[PDB]
């Protein structure tokens, strides 16, 4: 399924609890699933940005 974006539960759950568009989170997990590390790393990438 290349014409569909996957989003595992862990990343999905946190994504919904964090308020981030998992789609915006280029998932690289087996089957195009946005991995937890993907959402977490990005979520922090935003907060990491100071200026």
| Residues 25, 38 contacting (CB under 8 angstroms) | yes
- Radius of gyration in angstroms for the set of CA atoms belonging to the chain, rounded to a whole number: 11
Residue 25's CB is within 10 A of a number of other CB atoms, namely 21
Residue 27's CB is within 10 A of a number of other CB atoms, namely 20
User: Cα torsion at 37, 17, 21, 29 (round to 10°)?
Assistant: 30
CATH number, domain 1-51: 4.10.320.10
| Residues 7, 33 contacting (CB under 8 angstroms) | yes
Q: Where are the beta strands (DSSP E) in the chain?
A: none
Residues 45, 31: Cα–Cα separation, whole Å: 24
Phi, psi angles (nearest 5°) of residue 34? -65, 110
Q: Structure solved using which method?
A: NMR
Q: Is the dihedral of CA 29, 37, 11, 23 positive or negative?
A: negative
């Amino acid at each position: 399924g290349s014409r569909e974006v996957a989003a595992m539960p862990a990343a999905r759950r946190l994504a919904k609890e964090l308020g981030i568009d998992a789609s915006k989170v280029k998932g690289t997990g087996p089957g195009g699933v946005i991995t937890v590390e993907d959402v977490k790393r990005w979520a922090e990438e935003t907060a990491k940005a100071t200026a």
